[PDB]
Ligand binder design. Sequence first.
Ligand code: HEM
Ligand SMILES: OC(Cn1cncn1)(Cn1cncn1)c1ccc(F)cc1F
Length: 450
Amino acid sequence: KLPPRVPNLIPYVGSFVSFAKNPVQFIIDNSKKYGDVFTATILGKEMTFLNHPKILDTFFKATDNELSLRDVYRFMRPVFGTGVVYDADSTERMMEQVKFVSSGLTTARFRVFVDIFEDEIAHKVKELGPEGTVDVAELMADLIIFTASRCLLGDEVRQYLSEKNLGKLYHDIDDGISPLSFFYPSLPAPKRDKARKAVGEIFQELLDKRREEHKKHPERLLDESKMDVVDHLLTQKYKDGQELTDVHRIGILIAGLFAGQHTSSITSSWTLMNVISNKKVLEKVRKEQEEIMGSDKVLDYDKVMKMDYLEACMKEALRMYPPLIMIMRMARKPRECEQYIIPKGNILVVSPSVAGRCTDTYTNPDVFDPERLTERKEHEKFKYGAVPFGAGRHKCIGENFALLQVKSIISILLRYFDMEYIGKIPDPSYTSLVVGPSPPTRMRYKLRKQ
Ligand code: HEM
Ligand SMILES: OC(Cn1cncn1)(Cn1cncn1)c1ccc(F)cc1F
């Protein structure tokens, strides 16, 4: 047969409400009811949910003629741009773009990023003062609105991030992208579109400056450690010889910068928060920190490689708060899963949010406990037991940059500060397309060298 169905409140609207209440809880409740698979009409979309690691093989290895991304995240267009990534001409033109960014994220560059991380957290401590309080959130995003910019675009950008308000414009973009937009791609959003244009120009500009810097400084091109994304773009040609257009450029910089900022700064928040609020942890971390930093007064890519425990904390925050709670693919052929046959036109959904709290994989899964990963190995149980980065053909290609970018920021931060958190770990907030713990998230901080 077809999968069971969430019986609807109404035709059309279907189950939008209890889904929208808590997207994840929804999927969990109904799993227990109707089993490993089940369909639910949500604002007129046929969304089948796959709900047990065992079965997620097919979802991830199917091809983009079988299971389309482009179909489903196409709505991102007004953000990224036209003919870009999910709105790109093809499966293969997307990939080719993806890789352009992922070339800005090489071992050579990573070494330079760690220096950038410092340079900025320095500039940042100034703004704070020896002690006070601050929304962790606001800070991660604010650190990360600066680091990434430089990491991918290069220090050239910083004069804009500073003088020209670029952060704010990012928010106008990034606060005009409801997850509703998925069900209504044409929901009018003028103030975003003004921002995305203003950005557009600047990103253009940027290239226009960067071109003259190649004429005046060609040697840059041979040196792997200044070859940022912008360059890779300015000096590459799709695999068939077709040139890239500045609008493909300007739009792929943003495609990245989007990928870069939010998911990370949210894991920066969720992780720290659980560390400075479990003393057995904040311990082990500072042991590792101090073992490693030794006589050194600043960070390096090798140090950060060795920050194993801390990574388990960030892994753990992802099992507790994966900021992409839902991975989606439209079906174009009909699909055989288990005994069922999911029909063409449906949308297939898989949740990390869920998979991280399944109970065969994880004991006391409401308990933040890096030892579940490092000693108990709970994530190795099933081959898709934990998937914060996705997997198969579309596995995140920022994984290592991410890990690098946070681990670095949290380390560097601890060093500077003794910090403690105020009241409980807030719950997730399901208001945005990237899911982060809910405001306010304040913490006391005071320094460590007079
Ligand atoms: C907490 C940090 C992050 C998490 C949890 C995360 C998660 C994911 C997940 C779950 C997917 C799979 C989407 C799918 O299969 O449908 C993905 C794909 C992707 N990610 Fe990330 N990511 C993170 C950071 C980054 C960063 C920092 C960048 C770039 C700077 C990035 C760039 C991308 C790109 C380009 C893909 C495309 C894969 C494809 O071609 O479909 N990610 N990520
Ligand atoms: O996959 C995302 C967008 N997305 C997927 N579901 C909901 N939003 C996020 N992402 C994952 N890692 C980093 N960002 C992405 C993929 C590529 C990209 F260029 C932007 C972008 F948001």
